[PDB]
């Protein structure tokens, strides 16, 4: 049959190794690593989660150059936890006036059609977030955040973010 040519998510052709090695869940969800431009892909092969109750998430900075408040963000990620921290996942939308390091006080959360199975999490989906800052000085961020009352353990795998703000072209032999 015909090859498909559409996805809810398109990853950047360049991945990034998670530099930090220990993450400690928290109400002040830590930012797993300085956010990049408008699309990125993070992949850690051994992140240790110090027991705590909260959550660690991953970011992407909303490029706000195109005249258009409601753009499309997509997240594709596969994660394996050694233990099954009964945790939920979600796309987060928090703005900040300076480089974030932690999901601040006020943030907004959206449901992501993902697949849960034990210490396994997989998801390839997208949602529509208002990308213009709801506040003057700020810079809005979107991300993937897991959250639970964590029990120390390890996870490995990858998480990818993207802001459909321009489309990628692929070869369709029949065009």
């Amino acid at each position: 049959m015909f090859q498909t040519f559409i996805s809810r998510h398109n990853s950047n052709f360049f991945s990034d190794k998670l530099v930090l090695t220990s993450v400690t869940p928290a109400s002040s969800a830590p930012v797993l690593q300085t956010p990049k431009a408008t699309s990125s892909t993070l992949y850690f092969d051994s992140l240790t989660v110090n027991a705590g109750n909260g959550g660690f998430l991953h970011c992407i900075q909303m490029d706000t150059s195109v005249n258009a408040a409601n753009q499309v963000v997509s997240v594709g990620a596969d994660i394996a936890f050694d233990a099954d921290p009964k945790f939920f996942a979600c796309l987060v939308r928090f703005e900040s006036s300076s480089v974030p390091t932690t999901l601040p006080t006020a943030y907004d959360v959206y449901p992501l059609n993902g697949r849960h199975d034990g210490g396994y999490y997989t998801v390839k989906d997208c949602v529509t977030i208002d990308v213009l800052p709801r506040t003057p000085g700020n810079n809005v961020y979107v991300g993937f955040m897991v959250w639970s009352n964590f029990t120390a353990t390890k996870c490995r795998g990858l998480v990818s973010l993207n802001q459909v703000i321009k489309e990628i072209i692929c070869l369709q032999p029949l065009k």
Partner: protein, 143 residues
């Protein structure tokens, strides 16, 4: 520049609390303050009342209206509108500008979302709840 916002945003509450008369019918103080959801066909009433809390005295006494800076409109919504309706309540008011802008001769009308965010903050930091004021209802009529 935002604390300043907040700042004034709150300062308005005290100013509201003072409010001489309220030009709302007992009822209307309802669509307004109740916890029953505002549906599309309501918006106007909504506006009318939300508005009413902003230009009260002025109307009731006889002076002409004139633009309320956002921080104010915020406080008001924040203060009388019930959370279930704070959103649409903001959508209905979307337009006015922050004191700053006004002061600076800079057209920059606040689009809904800002109005919201602002009130939201004004709402956490506010501590002078209407509830404590249910006797405020006194100032609610023609006398």
């Amino acid at each position: 520049e935002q604390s300043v916002r907040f700042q004034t945003a709150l300062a308005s509450i005290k100013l509201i609390q003072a409010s001489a008369v309220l030009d709302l019918t007992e009822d209307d103080f309802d669509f307004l303050t109740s916890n029953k959801v505002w549906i599309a066909t309501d918006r106007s009433r909504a506006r009318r009342c939300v508005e009413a809390c902003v230009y009260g005295t002025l109307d009731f006494v006889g002076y002409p209206r004139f633009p309320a800076p956002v921080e104010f409109i915020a406080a008001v919504i924040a203060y009388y509108v019930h959370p279930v309706n704070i959103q649409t309540a903001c959508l209905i008011m979307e337009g006015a500008e922050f004191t700053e802008n006004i002061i600076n001769g800079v057209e920059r009308p606040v689009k809904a979302a800002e109005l919201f965010a602002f009130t939201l903050r004004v709402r956490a930091g506010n501590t002078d709840v209407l509830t404590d004021a249910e006797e405020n209802v006194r100032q609610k009529l023609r006398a």
